Amino acid sequence: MSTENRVIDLVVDENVPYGLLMQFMDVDDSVYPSTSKPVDLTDFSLRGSIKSSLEDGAETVASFTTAIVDAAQGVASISLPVSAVTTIASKASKERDRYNPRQRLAGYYDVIITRTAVGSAASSFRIMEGKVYISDGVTQ
């Protein structure tokens, strides 16, 4: 009955690899209390992309590298290497904000988890969405 929070804004650090890991857990409310079992990520793949705008025809700033850490514990990690961080830093907006000159808007990102197989239905699902920001660094 409560609300979800699909909109998440990420903040990356320039010159540093960014690593985010998501855990999918099955839940239920019954006579016995909340029973949680990790979701088995088999045939589950992720794919995320970043563009500088929502409107059609937006320039693709970069794309995220997807991997699954532990299927039994239902843990998947979504991250990008340091070179991708530099690429996004180059393509970010040059407009600074006072009280914190570090952060600059980089664009919008989405993540779809999908399960594709002959017996599996062609079902996709946008797990998250939001904007990507950059914390500019001076080292390196």
Binding site: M1, S2, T3, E4, N5, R6, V7, I8, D97, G130
Partner: protein, 298 residues
């Protein structure tokens, strides 16, 4: 950065899995706060100056909305959620309170840039509107248990309030005999619930939020203001004597609150022009109080 303007907001009430976006909102007021346990442990060893304060509970929020009447009559759901039984477009005050706990619902206060404040476990505790020579408006008062900040929300694109109803002069009747020299008819309805605080030792080192409540009483009331007018010497119809039981109706072109039997108490003020003031409550054995909602053409 993003500032939050009250004029640039949207209030959506989430009930039964459907969003009731309450447009035609004149003004709303709300606040959020936390409860603290601040003790100062001054001892003969150390007469300290620094307190031991821990935040352990969320103070219940008191949200007040002022909503204009509308042609689609979404605002009658506040009577529906507050406990009144429904038949057609008329709301009855039940003889007995139906359930122990009130009808709980969630409420969103949307703003730009995915900003939102999420009030949960709300219940309608007060609804009162004054039928007067100004445009009628019903101020509802809801109390929340838990408030939160969320990114995505529920927005009532379809369920919304229509155009505001045109003004129409109020008139109060006894059966079908009009009561002369009306000034201001104010109606009040309440669901005086109470929070059941169940903060226990299992909630130590955690923030507690009120979740359950029970209805102490429901009531329907009205205060009528007249000018002291008499048509005869020693008149019987218009005087200051109390009326144990008398059928009353505060009627408008779009709403009519009916008291099948009313207990009226009168109060005279020797002001610039003498004014009498009624205090109308339904009697013990009176039939359920009616509240009709006429959109257009009755």
């Amino acid at each position: 950065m993003f500032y939050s303007l009250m004029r640039e907001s949207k209030i959506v009430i989430e009930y039964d899995g459907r969003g009731y976006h309450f447009d035609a909102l004149s003004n709303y007021d709300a606040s959020t706060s936390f409860q603290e346990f601040k003790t100062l442990r001054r001892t003969i060893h150390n007469r300290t100056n620094y307190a031991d304060s821990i935040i352990n509970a969320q103070d219940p929020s008191s949200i007040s909305l002022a909503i204009n009447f509308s042609t689609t009559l979404i605002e009658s759901n506040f009577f529906d959620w507050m406990g009144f039984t429904r038949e057609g477009n008329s709301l009855f005050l039940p003889r007995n309170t139906p359930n122990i706990e009130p009808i709980m619902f969630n409420m969103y206060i949307i703003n730009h840039n995915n900003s939102c404040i999420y009030f949960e476990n709300c219940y309608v505790s007060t609804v009162d509107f004054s039928l007067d020579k100004s445009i009628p408006i019903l101020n509802v008062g809801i109390e929340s248990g838990k408030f939160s900040e969320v990114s995505t929300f529920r927005d009532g694109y379809t369920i919304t309030q229509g155009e505001v109803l045109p003004y129409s002069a109020p008139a109060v009747y006894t059966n079908s005999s009009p009561l002369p020299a009306l000034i201001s008819a104010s109606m009040s309805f309440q669901q005086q619930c109470s929070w059941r605080e169940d903060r226990n030792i299992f909630d130590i080192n955690k923030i507690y939020t009120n979740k359950r409540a029970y209805v102490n009483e429901m009531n329907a009331s009205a205060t009528l203001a007249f000018y002291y007018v008499k048509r005869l010497v020693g008149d019987k119809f218009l005087n200051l004597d109390p009326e144990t039981r008398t059928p009353l109706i505060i009627k408008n072109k779009y709403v009519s609150i009916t008291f099948p039997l009313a207990r009226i108490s009168k109060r005279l003020n020797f002001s610039d022009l003498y004014q009498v003031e009624y205090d109308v409550i339904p009697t013990a054995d009176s039939d359920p109080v009616e509240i009709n909602f006429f959109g257009e053409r009755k």
